[PDB]
């Protein structure tokens, strides 16, 4: 007769939603790693085969900056860091005054007061009766409070410090973030499609791909590469305010080595053997460094400036010569390698025709800190235990983190410096394609049919 | 015009039976706002649930509510009345439970004092309700063994 409403349960309808995701570890049990790896050993195993269902005809709007999956992952990484630091040994009594003197850099090395020889008039208990021990400290970890070569460890009057357990490992492993039932993860599979906007090509997944939580500051490491052309990501406004995200199509290789042959010393601090330290180096005194093929880095920088004038839209002077720093984490490429924390001078990579050329492979000097303040806000700092032997890690450089110096000078000024952006931007760099939605399966529509009969 | 949630609690049983949907809704629209977690999604992540057991304690309260809903829907299910709010059964009304006539019950009594008068025999009625179905189960059983 007339038109009547009819209830439909299970219609393909979704709305933008933020929900609680959970962790998932690859189903290897990571037996070849010897401890837990970001405490993600205890985490639901992935399905042997994931089901990815392509959605024909579907076009959905994405926003990697409004995704919040990034903020969730960020808090998850922070909390995991704290959960792994809580049970470990806190070095509260180790802030005693140190009598330290400078020791010579080698005649093959830049004469710097670096790696300081420090003696401890500190007593642990009455049993110790102010034992005198000596340890090797990188210059950055210590400050000269009073003259006559009197020293203390930095931070000790500001906050406590805790020692990373030697057993736990900082190696990032792939983590698939999964949504519960009734929610879904949407994945844009257009390779060239920029980070945000409507995606003509959408698939649905129960869990995302394997995302490695690589701690980095200047350049992104061990990420995933965009196919075909490299990708450049800013916000809508684009005018000296955001942080430029770069995703490369070809990875560059970077080898970082610490040649010093460290050892172990000053074991027992607390009841029982509780603390690791650096014995005297065996062999030559060489400073840490990283090489990057000068040819490949000049090619990659060229393709970068080509895509910069591409997204910019207007011919303009784009320089790299300068670089500016706040703190330490923006002047240096901060990252982690084997459990030691490296901080590298990138000025050779960010100058103007720096090559010639002058080296087969560009070399960057890197200093090392065992006291770091990544996610240690104001209160709890971490001491990375020393690593015995020589250190050497090979890393894929997949992305970059940049910042403009936009300035209405009629296209004259426009300078791009390697910012030391937050870690959340690293998560945005791999979450750009994913999005969380909630299913609203209830649709009502008229089909001019009525349930006359009741019961 | 609709008296509101539990509005007809002092009305005659017939009037409340007309607005049972109103009482039915507070089972869902208390729990839609809490499962939403939309206003909860951003406020200090998940309302800081670390070192706050009130958060878990709160969560356990939410669990009790959906658990009670599942108890009532189970009872409607095992009585074959899942889809309907008013269903008639095969169980005859034993007069020992209440001797009041129909007019006195539906136009002179409220659901509160009725539930108080019959709370004594509720378990027996439920037993007949779980039992009576069993004769329908048996008729379907005759249709099964041919």
């Amino acid at each position, epitope marked *: 007769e007339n038109l009547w409403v009819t209830v439909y349960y299970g219609v393909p309808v979704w709305k933008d939603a933020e929900t609680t995701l959970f962790c998932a570890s690859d189903a290897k049990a990571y037996e070849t790693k010897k401890h837990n790896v970001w405490a993600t050993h205890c985490c639901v195993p992935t399905d042997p085969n994931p089901q990815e269902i392509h959605l024909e005809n579907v076009t959905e709007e994405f926003n990697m900056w409004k995704n919040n999956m990034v903020e969730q992952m960020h808090e998850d990484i922070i909390s995991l860091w704290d959960q792994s630091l809580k049970p470990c040994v806190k070095l509260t009594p180790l802030c005693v005054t140190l009598q330290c003197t400078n020791v010579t850099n080698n005649i093959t090395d830049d004469m710097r007061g670096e790696l300081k020889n420090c003696s401890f008039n500190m007593t642990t208990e009455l049993r110790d009766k102010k034992q005198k021990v000596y340890s090797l400290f990188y210059r950055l970890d210590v400050v000269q409070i009073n003259s006559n070569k009197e020293y203390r460890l930095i931070n000790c009057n500001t906050s406590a410090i805790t020692q990373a357990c030697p057993k736990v490992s900082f190696e990032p492993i792939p983590i698939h973030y999964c949504a519960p039932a009734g929610f879904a993860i949407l994945k844009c599979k257009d390779k060239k499609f920029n980070g945000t906007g409507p995606c003509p090509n959408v698939s649905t997944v129960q869990c995302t791909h394997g995302i490695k939580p690589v701690v980095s500051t200047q350049l992104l490491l061990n990420g995933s590469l965009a196919e075909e052309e490299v990708i450049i990501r800013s916000e809508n406004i684009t005018n000296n305010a955001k942080n430029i995200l770069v995703q490369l199509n070809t990875p560059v290789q970077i080898n970082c080595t610490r040649p010093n042959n460290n050892t172990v010393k000053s074991i027992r601090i607390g009841p029982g053997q509780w603390f690791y330290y650096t014995g005297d180096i065996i062999g030559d005194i060489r400073q840490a460094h990283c090489n990057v093929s000068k040819a490949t880095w000049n090619e990659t920088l060229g393709k970068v400036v080509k895509q910069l004038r591409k997204h910019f839209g207007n011919n303009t002077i784009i320089r790299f010569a300068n670089s500016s720093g706040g703190d330490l984490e923006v002047t240096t490429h901060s990252f982690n390698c084997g459990g030691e924390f490296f901080y590298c001078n990138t000025s050779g990579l960010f100058n103007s025709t720096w090559i010639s050329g002058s080296n087969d492979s560009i070399t960057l000097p890197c200093r090392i800190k065992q006291i770091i303040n990544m996610w*240690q806000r104001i209160g709890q700092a971490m001491y990375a235990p020393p690593i015995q032997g020589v250190i050497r890690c090979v890393s894929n450089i997949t992305g970059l983190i940049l910042t403009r110096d936009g300035g209405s000078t009629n296209s004259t000024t426009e300078t791009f410096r390697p910012g030391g952006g937050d870690m959340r931007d690293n998560w945005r760099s791999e979450l750009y394609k994913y999005k969380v939605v909630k299913i609203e399966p209830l649709g009502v529509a008229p089909t001019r049919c009525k349930r006359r009969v009741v019961g | 015009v609709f008296l509101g949630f539990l509005g007809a609690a002092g009305s005659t049983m017939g009037a409340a039976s007309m607005t049972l949907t109103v009482q039915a809704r507070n089972l869902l629209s208390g729990i839609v706002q809490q499962q939403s977690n939309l206003l909860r999604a951003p406020e200090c992540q998940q309302h800081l649930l670390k070192d706050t057991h009130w958060g878990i304690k709160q969560l356990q309260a939410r669990v009790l509510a959906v658990e009670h809903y599942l108890r009532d829907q189970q009872l409607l299910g095992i009585w074959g009345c899942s889809g309907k709010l008013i269903c008639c059964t095969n169980v005859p009304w034993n007069s020992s439970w209440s001797n009041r006539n129909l007019s006195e019950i539906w136009d002179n009594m409220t659901w509160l004092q009725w539930d108080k008068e019959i709370s004594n025999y509720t378990q027996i009625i439920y037993g007949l309700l779980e039992e009576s179905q069993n004769q329908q189960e048996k008729n379907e059983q005759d249709l099964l063994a041919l």
Partner: nanobody
């Protein structure tokens, strides 16, 4: 927050370096998405934003005084500092340290400023 204690030398000679300290009390420092700026005001004239240091690290200063301004941030010391080299008589002004929070997400427990 409400207690931003400033300290330093109110007396600087020409061609020297001006260092200033701004301490924060309410520990809003460790909170992310916060920008801490140094601003000076010349008398009679308007106020000039000198530079700002971000929650990650000091990104930018003012282009006029870009090479002679350096803003540092001592995380654990709860403070952040400003340095200005080659002090001239034109830099004689009143200096402030000010805080402001910008959130790309708009995703917090409360509303920020």
């Amino acid at each position: 927050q409400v207690q931003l204690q400033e300290s330093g030398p109110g007396r600087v000679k020409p061609s020297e370096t001006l260092s200033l300290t701004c301490a924060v009390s309410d520990d809003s420092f460790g909170s992310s998405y916060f920008y801490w700026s140094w601003i000076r005001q010349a008398p009679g004239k308007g106020l000039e934003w000198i530079g700002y240091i971000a929650y990650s690290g000091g990104v930018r200063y003012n282009p006029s005084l870009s090479s002679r301004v350096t803003i540092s941030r001592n995380i654990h010391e709860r403070q952040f500092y400003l340095r200005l080299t080659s002090m001239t008589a034109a830099d004689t002004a009143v200096y402030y340290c000010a805080r402001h929070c910008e959130d790309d997400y708009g995703y917090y427990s409360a509303a920020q400023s």
